[PDB]
Structure formats: structure tokens, C-alpha cells
Design a protein around this ligand. Structure first.
Ligand code: HEM
Ligand code: HEM
Length: 190
């Protein structure tokens, strides 16, 4: 576990994009407030591993807006940082009724005919995720960010989901409209 108190002093450079409490400004910048600590810590290592200046291809998660930013932080530092954001309360967004209806259907039922499972098993009914298992909280996240992740998983641009490649196999059955409907519904999910 991490020391949130210590962690809040190690986040200066983060605030411009993620906000001081992790409740991001720009839609393309993922909110980190109230996200699970295990998931956060995991993304911090994947990001540090993949976004390091001379990083090898396909290792970790490459985030170019964060190149070499986590390199001087130790793993304990990352723990305090994850404990810091994780303890922040998340803001909720708005789900457009126009899209929410198809998003909810896809979220709760998946696409049985495609053999695509619903999202509720791993991300919980209200999108709060499963911290102990490391399944990310999804509710209230910026739609543009969620849409991008879903697209990335599908195009194989994000690969830090393991050997089971849980999200790449799920996302592979999603259409652009699906993703748009899902990302919008999840943004108002709370
Ligand atoms: C500062 C040291 C810092 C931290 C901490 C941080 C964390 C972080 C995480 C945990 C993610 C993943 C979130 C998730 O998976 O839900 C992530 C992703 C992005 N970040 Fe970040 N981030 C820090 C700093 C910054 C700064 C200063 C910027 C903006 C210039 C930035 C931006 C982004 C972007 C963009 C992503 C998402 C990338 C994508 O998948 O499209 N980060 N951050
Ligand atoms: C259902 C169609 C579905 C959605 C929607 C969904 C989305 C989703 C997103 C957008 C992420 C990234 C979150 C972030 O960057 O903050 C993501 C990541 C993971 N998911 Fe998922 N997910 C859906 C379904 C499922 C199912 C059925 C499972 C469990 C079998 C699951 C699990 C996970 C895991 C694990 C991750 C984390 C990947 C990592 O980098 O560690 N999802 N999901």
C-alpha cells in the first residue's frame, strides 16, 4: 500500500493535465480521482516501462504525453501516488440520453451473438470496478478518453491487458457506434 500523504507531494507535474485532485479538465485527460489503487499503480509501472525515452516496442503502455516523466520515481513513490489519487473523490459526468440507452444495453448485456460479454461482471453494475482484482473503475470517466481506450484495445494499440488480452478480445467486437454509445453511458454512470 501507499502513503497518500507523501503521494500528494510527488504530483506537481501531474496537476496541469490531471488536476490537483485528479479530476481532469480536458476530456482527453483521464480522471484519476477515486480510481482503484492497484489499477493506478499498475498503469504507473506500465506507463513508466513503456514511456521511458529508449523504450522497446510493445513493452508496457506508451503514453507520449508522459515520456520520461515517471523515470526518477521509485516504486514506493508510485505507490504513494496511486494511494493519493485513489483517495480523491471522483466527479460524475453527464450521459446523453440519446446515446445512454444503447450504452446501457451494451454495458449490461454485451453482445451474446458475438460472444462479447457484458461489462458488469468485471467493472461492476455501476462501473466502480473491482479494486482487489484490479479491474478499473469506469464510471464518470471522460467519454473521449474511454472511447479512445476502447478503440485502442480494438486496434491493438493498447496491449497492457495481459496474456488473456481481456480487453482486446472484448473490444474487438465493438463498433464505432458501440464505443460511442458505451463511452457516453459510462460517463454518467455512478
Ligand atoms: C504526474 C507524475 C502524472 C501521473 C501520476 C499521471 C498518471 C496517469 C495515469 C494513472 C494514467 C492512466 C489513467 C487510466 O488508465 O485510467 C495516465 C494517462 C494519461 N496521462 Fe497522465 N499522469 C501524470 C502526468 C501527466 C501530464 C503532465 C499530462 C498532460 C501533458 C498527462 C497526460 C495523460 C494522458 C494524455 C494520458 C492518457 C493517454 C491515453 O491513453 O490516451 N499525464 N496518467
Ligand atoms: C464491456 C463491453 C466493457 C467495457 C466498456 C470496458 C471498458 C474498459 C475500459 C474503457 C478500460 C480502461 C479503463 C482505463 O483506462 O481507466 C478497461 C480496462 C480493463 N477491463 Fe474492461 N470493459 C468491458 C468489459 C470487461 C470485462 C468483461 C472484463 C473482465 C473479464 C474487463 C476487465 C478489464 C481489465 C482487467 C482492465 C484493465 C487492463 C489493464 O491495463 O490492466 N473488462 N475496460
Amino acid at each position: 500500500a501507499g502513503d497518500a500523504e507523501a503521494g500528494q507531494g510527488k504530483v506537481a507535474v501531474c496537476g496541469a493535465c490531471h488536476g490537483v485532485d485528479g479530476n481532469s479538465p480536458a476530456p482527453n485527460f483521464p480522471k484519476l480521482a477515486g480510481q482503484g489503487e492497484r489499477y493506478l499503480l499498475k498503469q504507473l509501472q506500465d506507463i513508466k516501462a513503456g514511456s521511458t525515452p529508449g523504450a522497446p516496442e510493445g513493452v508496457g503502455r506508451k503514453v507520449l504525453e508522459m515520456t520520461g516523466m515517471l523515470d526518477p520515481l521509485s516504486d514506493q513513490d508510485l505507490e504513494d501516488i496511486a494511494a493519493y489519487f485513489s483517495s480523491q473523490k471522483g466527479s460524475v459526468g453527464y450521459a446523453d440520453p440519446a446515446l445512454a440507452k444503447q450504452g446501457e444495453k451494451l454495458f449490461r448485456g454485451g453482445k451474446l451473438d458475438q460472444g462479447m460479454p457484458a461489462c458488469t461482471g468485471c467493472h461492476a453494475p455501476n462501473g466502480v470496478g473491482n479494486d482487489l482484482a484490479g479491474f478499473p473503475k469506469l464510471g464518470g470517466q471522460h467519454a473521449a478518453y474511454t472511447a479512445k481506450q476502447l478503440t485502442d484495445f480494438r486496434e491493438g494499440n493498447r496491449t497492457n491487458d495481459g496474456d488473456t488480452m481481456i480487453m482486446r478480445g472484448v473490444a474487438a467486437k465493438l463498433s464505432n457506434k458501440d464505443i460511442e454509445a458505451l463511452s457516453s453511458y459510462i460517463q454518467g454512470l455512478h
